[PDB]
């Protein structure tokens, strides 16, 4: 959806789109779509721009323009949240995980699990590291 | 008066197995993504 | 009047307010009343395309537009968009 | 995704009050029991 | 060691809707001090 | 909700609280509300 | 399933040839590139190394001086690490050209070390 973007980037994406709107009617040409992206910082190749417009006369507006970089922001974070996951898990922040706390920290995680499923998810991963635990958790 | 209740008594539900396991698989999820909270009993009881 | 909503920059960042305004209801029946052959194809394509973009904003905005497919299926009867694609 | 959710104190203060009312409504307003219907129906009837 | 997870159920483990729900729970398991729980009950 | 005021005890109170309901029926059905 | 295909064993030489020239495309995106590059490493496994000499000509042509074909390097090191039991002189032919300029240090590093057969 359009929930993974919080508000302040779209507060920056509007006037970045509106300045290169050619007529004030909220539309742009197909070629200026890369030129605004140079001002954003994300500079993809030429090959990453046809499949944008192949997905959607050559007339692009702020409705269709949000759906491009929403597809280009989730993929830059969906494979990245597995890095930011483990930061409160262990003690010092390295990668080794004591299995003693993991038998009872998962029963008050807020998703309201039981003691049955958490025993179904510990021996299939004494001490299991950070990267085999997420390999059976991220599926 | 005796038409508008004989029409009501026909449109009263009984138990429904084909609606039952839909409510089970709906309850197979606990919390939707991006911190959205799932309304539990809004639709909730789908049978009866 | 529809097209100025498509870049107001607040419609794209307050999805709870837009259905509390009930603006998806009010744009719905103006498509219905012209539909009631076809009369005016240059607005039903422009209005229902906004509704499809409205459904793709949040979680519960899809939930709000979900209830009306009982009626939206009853108007299945044209190059461009269509109110059937709002149901899909 | 049950760990990456934000705490309160990073929120914009205009979004705290949006969910504060939705909490304050269903926990404090709706929980009150008021029984005005006893004395609305009789003075409307003694008014001959 | 073990009771810290009962404290750790909010700050990264409770969604911001359900955060203020349990913060607003006091009437008749609460993290609120006795001073700032009074001025609400002067408003209501 | 007006008539719902009644719907280890003894005899006399349990028919005393059968007229008080029956009075509340009398307040409301004598004014044509039965046909409504 | 493709292990044990001594019946028909020459179109797989033509199969494995044309995908490597399809592995780079003049008009292909990175999203489609990840699929064809995944099929190469999987077809490197589950096959006996008799037909591996057919493709082994084009592998060693101009690779170790550059680093627009790092995918071939991982394709190389996985084909001989599981073959520790001849045009193998081509490996010795690229046993010098890599260290000309000496980035992607740990991409072609062990590719020489796994070529040690």
What would the two tokens of residue C65 be? 């537009």
CA distance B34 to chain E (A): 9
E10, E15, E16: best to mutate for the B interface, most B CBs within 10 A = E15
Beta strand spans in chain B (E) = none
CA pair distance F3, F25, nearest whole angstrom: 7
Backbone φ/ψ region at E14: left (φ over 0), alpha (ψ -120 to 50), beta:
beta
Q: Looking at the complex, report in whole angstroms how far the Cα of residue C55 sits from the nearest Cα belonging to chain A.
A: 9
Chain E residues lying within 8 Å of B37, measured CB to CB: 15, 17-18
Q: Can you tell me the distance from the alpha carbon of F33 to that of C47, in angstroms, rounded to the nearest whole number?
A: 49
Of the candidates A78, A83, A76, A102, the one whose C-alpha atom is nearest the C-alpha of residue A91 is A102
- Spell out the long-range contacts of C78-83 with Cβ–Cβ below 8 A and sequence spacing 24 or more: C78/C38, C78/C41, C80/C41, C80/C45, C81/C45, C81/C48, C81/C49, C81/C52, C82/C44, C82/C45, C82/C48, C83/C31, C83/C35, C83/C44, C83/C48, C83/C51
Chain D nearest-CA residue for E22: D23
Q: Which chain D residues contact residue F28 at CB under 8 A? A: 41
Which residue's entry shows tokens 């307040």?
F27
Contact status of B8 with chain E (Cβ, < 8 Å): no
Give the 3-state secondary structure of C47-65: HHHHHHHHHCCCCHHHHHH
B32 contacts on C by Cβ (under 8 Å): 59
Q: Which residue of A has its CA nearest to C2?
A: A63
Residue A118 DSSP label: H
DSSP, res B5: T
User: Under an 8 A CB cutoff, do A51 and G30 touch?
Assistant: no
DSSP assignment of chain G? --S---SS-SHHHHHHHHHHHHHS-TT--HHHHHHHHHHHHHHHSSS-TTTHHHHHHHHTSS-TT----SHHHHHHHHHHTT-----THHHHHTSSGGGS----TTTSSHHHHSS--
Dihedral angle, C-alpha A69, A73, A79, A81, nearest 10 °: -170
Helical (H) or strand (E) element with E22: helix E16-23
User: Cβ(G54)–Cβ(G17) under 8 Å?
Assistant: yes
Whole-Å CA distances, D18 to B34, D11, D13, G93: 17, 11, 9, 70
Are D2 and B35 within 8 A, CB to CB?
no
Question: How much of chain C is in helix, strand and coil states, percent to nearest 5?
Answer: 60, 0, 40
Residues of G in contact with A47 (CB under 8 A): 27-30
Q: Which residues of A touch G33 (CB under 8 A)?
A: none
Quick check: E44 contacting D, CB < 8 Å? yes
- By the CB < 8 Å criterion, does C53 face chain A? yes
In contact, G43 and G12? CB cutoff 8 Å: no
Q: Is E11 on the interface with D (CB under 8 A)?
A: yes
Question: Which of D2, D4, D12 lies at the smallest CB-CB distance from A109?
Answer: D2
Q: To the nearest whole angstrom, how far is the Cα of B28 from the nearest Cα of chain D?
A: 16
Q: Do D28 and E14 touch (CB under 8 A)?
A: no
- Going from the C-alpha of D8 to that of each of A4, A11, C60, D33, G14, the distances in angstroms are 18, 22, 22, 31, 61
Judged by CB atoms closer than 8 Å, whether chains meet at E13 and A101 is answered as no
Backbone dihedral angles phi then psi of residue C17, each to the nearest 5 degrees: -75, -35
Q: With CB atoms and an 8 Å threshold, state whether D37 touches F2.
A: yes
Listing DSSP states for chain F in one string gives: --GGG-----HHHHHHHHHHHHHHHHHHHTTTTTT-
On whether any CB of chain D is under 8 Å from the CB of E42, the answer is: no
Cα–Cα distance for residue pair C65/G60, rounded to 1 Å: 59
In the three-class reduction of DSSP (H, G, I as helix; E, B as strand; rest coil), residue C7 is classed as: helix
User: Would you call A51 and G29 a contact, using CB atoms and an 8 Å cutoff?
Assistant: yes
């Amino acid at each position: 959806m359009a929930d993974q973007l919080t508000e302040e980037q779209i507060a920056e994406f509007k006037e970045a789109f509106s300045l290169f709107d050619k007529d004030g009617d909220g539309t742009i040409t197909t070629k200026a779509l890369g030129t605004v992206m140079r001002s954003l910082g994300q500079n993809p190749t030429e090959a990453e721009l046809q499949d944008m417009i192949n997905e959607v006369n050559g007339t692009i507006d702020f409705p269709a323009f949000l759906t491009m970089m929403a597809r280009k922001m989730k993929d830059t974070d969906s494979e990245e949240e597995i890095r930011e996951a483990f930061r409160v898990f262990d003690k010092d922040g390295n990668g080794y995980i004591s299995a003693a706390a993991l038998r009872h920290v998962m029963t008050n995680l807020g998703e309201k699990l039981t003691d049955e499923e958490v025993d179904e998810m510990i021996r299939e991963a004494g001490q299991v590291n950070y990267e085999a635990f997420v390999q059976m958790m991220t599926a | 008066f005796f038409q508008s209740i004989q029409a009501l008594m026909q449109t009263c539900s009984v138990l429904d197995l084909n609606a039952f396991e839909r409510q089970n698989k709906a309850e197979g999820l606990g919390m939707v993504n991006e911190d959205g909270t799932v309304i539990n009993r809004q639709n909730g009881e789908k049978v009866m | 009047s529809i097209g100025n909503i498509m870049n107001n920059k607040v419609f794209y960042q307050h999805p709870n307010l837009m259905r509390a305004l009930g603006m998806h209801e009010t744009v719905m029946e103006v498509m219905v009343n012209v539909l009631g052959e076809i009369r005016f194809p240059k607005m039903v394509t422009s209005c229902c395309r906004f509704l499809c973009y409205f459904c793709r904003i949040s979680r519960q905005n899809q939930r709000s537009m979900f209830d009306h497919l009982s009626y939206l299926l009853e108007n299945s009867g044209m190059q461009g968009s269509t109110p059937l694609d709002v149901a899909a | 995704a049950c760990f990456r959710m934000t705490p309160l104190y990073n929120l914009p203060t205009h979004r705290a009050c949006n969910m504060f009312l939705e909490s304050y409504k269903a926990a404090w307003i709706l929980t009150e029991d008021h029984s005005f219907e006893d004395r609305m129906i009789d003075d409307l009837s003694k008014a001959g | 060691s073990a009771a810290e997870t009962a404290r750790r159920t909010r700050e990264f483990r409770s969604p911001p809707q359900e955060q203020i729900n349990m913060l607003l729970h006091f009437k008749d398991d609460c993290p609120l001090p006795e001073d700032i729980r009074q001025d609400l009950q002067d408003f209501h | 909700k007006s008539c719902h005021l009644e719907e280890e005890v003894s005899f006399e109170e349990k028919e005393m609280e059968k007229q008080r309901l029956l009075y509340q029926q009398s307040r409301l059905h004598t004014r044509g509300a039965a046909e409504m | 399933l493709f292990a044990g295909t001594e019946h028909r064993a020459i179109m797989v030489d033509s199969m494995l040839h044309t995908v490597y020239r399809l592995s780079r495309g003049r008009s292909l995106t990175k999203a489609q590139r990840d699929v064809i590059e995944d099929c190469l490493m999987a077809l490197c496994r589950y096959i006996r190394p008799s037909m591996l000499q057919h493709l082994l000509r084009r592998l060693v042509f101009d690779v170790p001086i550059l680093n627009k074909m790092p995918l071939k390097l991982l394709t190389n090191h996985y084909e001989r690490c599981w073959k520790y039991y001849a045009n193998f002189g081509v490996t010795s032919e690229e046993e010098l050209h890599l260290t000309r300029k000496l980035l992607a240090h740990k991409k072609y590093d062990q590719e020489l070390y796994r070529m040690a057969m």
